[PDB]
Symmetry: D2
Subunit: 210 residues, 4 copies
C-alpha cells in the first residue's frame, strides 16, 4: 505494498509531543523501540512521511532515533559535526520541509560537543585544526564570539548559544522555512541533549509547539 | 589504563556492522550499548569504530539498521549523502580526531535525491531553493551512469555510492593517506528498504571480504 | 550614487571601449593616492573569470569604480554570495552587474556533461554542476544555440541572487538597488543588456 | 574563428611580465597593452592567459590595471578577502588544469575590509549578518593564527592572511600541489600597496626567478 506516504503531514504540536514522550521513555530506561518490526520496515518501501527533521550533531553518543525512542520512517535526520550548516545541510532540511512537509525542525545540540570545544580552543589559544575540520570550526567560531560579547563564560552557555545561532541562520537563509513558520505549518525547536541522564532539554522555539 | 582511540581495525569494525545488520534483517536486534549504565559511561568521551555517511531519509536509520547503540558510530547524514565542506569536515573529524578505522557510505533504494536528479536530467524538472544544491551534486552520478549505459534506478543509486566514495578519496588527503597506510577503509553499501539488508557494493582498503 | 546613474556610467564606458576610444579614467598616480583613504564604488560586477572579460577594461572604468567578483562562469557559492552582499550592505553599491559572455568554457563544459556525460574531475566538477541546471532549464524550453544557454545562465544567476539574498531582494524592493544581466561579445566588445530587476533609466 | 592549441608559458616568464607590468603602473606610465581592437578580435579564437590572479574584490585593487595587463593575459578570480569556497577552488583549477597556467598569484593588499572585519570579530565580537559572515568566518583563522604568533599591526595580519590562503590552496588542491612538485606551476603571495601602487612579493612555492 500500500502507499501510505501521500496526503497531509501532522502538525508541530503532535510532532513535538511524540518526541517529548519518546525521550521520556529513553530517560526512564523504558524504550519501546517502536516502528522497527520486519513488517513495519517492509511497508515503508514505497515512500516516507516523517513527522520531524532532526538536525543534530554527528557525535556518536547523540543517536537521534535512539534518544527520542523513534523508529523507521519517524524522523528525517541531518547530522554534521557541531550541527554546522553548509548548502548540502540546508538543501537536506529544505527537502524535508518542502517535499515531506515535516511540521517540526529540531536543532539538537548536546553537552561535551567537540566542535564547540574546538572553536573555544581556536578563539582562546589560536589552536586551529587543518583540512576540512577547520571548515567545521570556522562555522562554530561566530557562536562563541557572539556569546563572549554577551558575557557568556561556560561551555554549556556556548553550546546553548550555538543551538540558538543555528536556529537563527536556518531562519535567515531559508525562506522555505521562515514562510512556513509564519504560516503556522512549521515550528523550529532548539534542544540540548544531556549525555549524563539522556534528557533532551527544550531551550528555544519559534512557533507553537503547545 | 585509559586508552585513547577506538582500538579496532577496519576488518573488525566492518564485521560488527555486518553482524548487526544480520540481527536486524532477521528481526532479532540486541539493541546493544544503550542501557542507562552504558550511557552514563559515555559522558567521559566517545570511541566510535566507524563513521556512517548516509542519506537523511527517515527509513535509513543507521544505528537501527546496523543494530548499534550509543558511542558506536559517528553519523553524518545529508539528502542523497551529498558532500560539501561541512560534510567533509565532519567525516574528517571522525577520521583524524576520533581515529575511526572505517567509513561507511550508506545509499539505499527509493532515494528521493537520486530520483530528483533523474527527473532533472530526463525532464529539466529542477527544485528551487537549496534543494537544487542537493540535486546538482547527485546529477553527475546519473550522467556518468547514463554514459556507461546504466538505465535502472537501482544502478544509479549504486553508481552514486561509488561516486561518493571516489569524491571522499579525491578531496581528502587525510582519508586517502590513511587508506594507503592501512589504518582506514571505506565501504559503499546499499540498504534495501524491503528486507533491511545492507548490501556490499564497494570498498577500498581491507575489510576482510577477500 | 543611484542605480540609473550607475548603469548610465557603465553603458557609456562600454561605448568608449567599443569605439576604441577609452579614457582609462580614475587611474592617475594622484587619484590612486586618494583611494588609500577608502573605496566608494558605483557597482559590483559579478563576472566570469575568463581572461578576455576584464570588467574594468570593457566598461572603461578605473580604480575605485567597481567592486569585482569573478568565478569561472559566474557560479555562486557562499564566499561569492558573501562578497556581493559586502558591496551591497557595507559599500551600498546601487548596482549589481551579472556579466556573462560568449564562448564561455563553463557553459560549454556543462553542455558537454549533459549531452555526453563528459565531466571534469576535482573542483572543476563543482563549477560545471552549478552551470548544469541553466542548461537543463533552457533545454526544457527548446533552447538549442550555445549563445542561448549563455543568456539563460545569466538570467538564472540573477534569479539565484534575488532568491538567496534578502539583503539584495529588499534593497531592490526599496529602490536603492538594481540588478542588471549583461552578455559581453568577444568580437566587438559590446556589453549587451539582456535582463534587469529594478529601474535602470 | 580559429582555435589554437599548444603549450602555455613558464612560471619565471609569467612572473617577470607581471613584475615589469606593475612597474609601469607604479611609474605612472601604463602602456595599456593587449587591448587594441585588432588584439581583441584575435581573442575570439581562445584565451591563453599566462597567470591566474586570485585577488580581493576591493574596487581599488583592479588586477589588470595594477599589473598593467590587457585582455587575454590573466585569468581572474576575485572574492572579498580572497576567501576560498568550492566555486573559487574550481575556478582556479580550471585555469591550472584546462588553461595550463604556469602561475597563480594570491593578491592581498593594505586596508582590506575583510581582514578588518575579521579583526573586529575576534576583538569585539562584532559579526556581520547574512552571507558577509561567511566571508569573515574564513578570514578569522588567519587572525587567530596571527595573534598566537604575536602579530599586532593590521598589515601583518593582511600578510598572514595571504600566506594562509596560499597554504589552503596547496592543501586542498592536489591538481595544484602536483604541478608545483612537477615544476610546471608556481604560486606567489603578493601584497598590493594602495599608497604607491606597488605589488610586493611576500611568499612563494616554486621557482619564480
Ligand atoms: Zn493501506
Ligand atoms: Zn503512491
Ligand atoms: Zn557535538
Ligand atoms: Zn533563540
Ligand atoms: Zn583519557
Ligand atoms: Zn536517499
Ligand atoms: Zn566564461
Ligand atoms: Zn589560427
Ligand atoms: Zn580546438
Ligand atoms: Zn580586500
Ligand atoms: Zn607562506
Amino acid at each position: 505494498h500500500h502507499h501510505h506516504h501521500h496526503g497531509p503531514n501532522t502538525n508541530p504540536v503532535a510532532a513535538w509531543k511524540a518526541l517529548k514522550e519518546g525521550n521520556e521513555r529513553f530517560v526512564a530506561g523504558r524504550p519501546q523501540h517502536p516502528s522497527q518490526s520486519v513488517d513495519h520496515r517492509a511497508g515503508l518501501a514505497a515512500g516516507q512521511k516523517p513527522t520531524a527533521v532532526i538536525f543534530g550533531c554527528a557525535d556518536s553518543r547523540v543517536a537521534a532515533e535512539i534518544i527520542f525512542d523513534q523508529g523507521l520512517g519517524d524522523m528525517f535526520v541531518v547530522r554534521t559535526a557541531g550541527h554546522v550548516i553548509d548548502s548540502a545541510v540546508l538543501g537536506s532540511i529544505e527537502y524535508a520541509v518542502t517535499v515531506l512537509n515535516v511540521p517540526l525542525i529540531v536543532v539538537l545540540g548536546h553537552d561535551s560537543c567537540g566542535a564547540v570545544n574546538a572553536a573555544l580552543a581556536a578563539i582562546n589559544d589560536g589552536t586551529l585544526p587543518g583540512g576540512y575540520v577547520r571548515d567545521v570550526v570556522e562555522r562554530v567560531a561566530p557562536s562563541v564570539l557572539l556569546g563572549r560579547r554577551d558575557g557568556l563564560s561556560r561551555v554549556d552557555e556556548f553550546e546553548q548559544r550555538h543551538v540558538h545561532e543555528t536556529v537563527a541562520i536556518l531562519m535567515a537563509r531559508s525562506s522555505a522555512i521562515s514562510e512556513r513558520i509564519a504560516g503556522g505549518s512549521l515550528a523550529i525547536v532548539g534542544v540540548t541533549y544531556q549525555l549524563d541522564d539522556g534528557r533532551a532539554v527544550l531551550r528555544d522555539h519559534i512557533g507553537n509547539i503547545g
